[PDB]
């Protein structure tokens, strides 16, 4: 099925010189790809967006999706807090920068344009227990200084 | 206050959820240890236990310190 590609670069919703994917109607500016693709050196063959690459990689199998995300979380056990979020970045296409809506409505003198113009009118356990004990010692010392201060001011 | 260990809801309908935050979780007394029942690892329990111990030590220290400052205030009051 030969679907028509969108005349707007889906990353910046603007029209211009863009390369299109053969498996999704999304087209993207050469400056919007990750990494930005040089219009002089084009990727030879069938080029796909990040979403299509990830999809064909996972072969539409949700079990593989969960397996790979679980492995990715298991490997990122130093930044585990972000792990899940990380697995989402390399799967989805990029977009330009737009602040959230609640930031748009903070001040009344600023208004938004349709073009995007905005106008005004292990070792680690040892280290961590060490930090614990050193801060504890520091603050109990500060408490001792509190007591010394109170005693010196009240004795006089 | 009462139990912390639930029933064993088998028929293979139990939710094992390995959390993405392991050092300040609370989650149950329904732990399962690995190298809604929530899985956990030894180092997480190590850190929770030492966290409890040090927080409690600082709490006791601050209690003794409040006692001593109230005492010295009432002492100089005399």
């Amino acid at each position: 099925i030969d679907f028509e590609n969108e005349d707007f670069c889906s990353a910046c919703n603007q029209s211009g010189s863009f390369l299109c994917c053969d498996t999704c109607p999304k087209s993207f500016h050469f400056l919007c790809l990750d990494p930005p693709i040089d219009p002089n050196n084009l990727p030879k063959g069938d080029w796909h967006c990040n979403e299509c690459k990830f999809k064909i990689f996972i072969n539409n199998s949700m079990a593989t999706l969960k397996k790979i995300e679980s492995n990715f979380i298991k490997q990122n056990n130093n930044v585990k807090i972000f792990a899940k979020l990380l697995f989402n970045i390399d799967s989805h296409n990029p977009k330009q920068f737009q602040l959230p809506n609640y930031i748009k409505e903070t001040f009344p003198a600023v208004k938004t344009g349709s073009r995007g113009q905005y106008s005004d009118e292990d070792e680690n356990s040892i280290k961590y227990d060490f930090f614990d004990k050193i801060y504890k010692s520091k603050m109990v010392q500060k408490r001792k200084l509190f007591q010394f201060q109170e005693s010196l001011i009240d004795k006089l | 206050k009462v139990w912390k260990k639930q029933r064993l809801i088998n028929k293979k309908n139990q939710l094992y959820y390995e959390p993405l935050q392991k050092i300040g979780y609370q989650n149950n007394g329904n732990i399962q240890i690995i190298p809604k029942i929530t899985q956990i690892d030894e180092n997480s329990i190590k850190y929770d236990f030492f966290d409890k111990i040090y927080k409690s030590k600082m709490v006791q220290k601050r209690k003794l310190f409040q006692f001593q400052e109230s005492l010295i205030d009432k002492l100089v009051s005399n």
Binding site: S125 | G29, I40, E42, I45, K46, F49
Partner: peptide
């Protein structure tokens, strides 16, 4: 630092795996 060594000592002393699992569950319930 030395508390890591305490946990290693406990794992050594208990010896068996299941009893160490029970020990860790005691610790977490605490």
């Amino acid at each position: 630092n030395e508390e890591v060594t305490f946990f290693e000592k406990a794992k050594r002393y208990i010896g068996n795996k299941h009893l160490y699992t029970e020990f860790l569950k005691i610790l977490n319930l605490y």
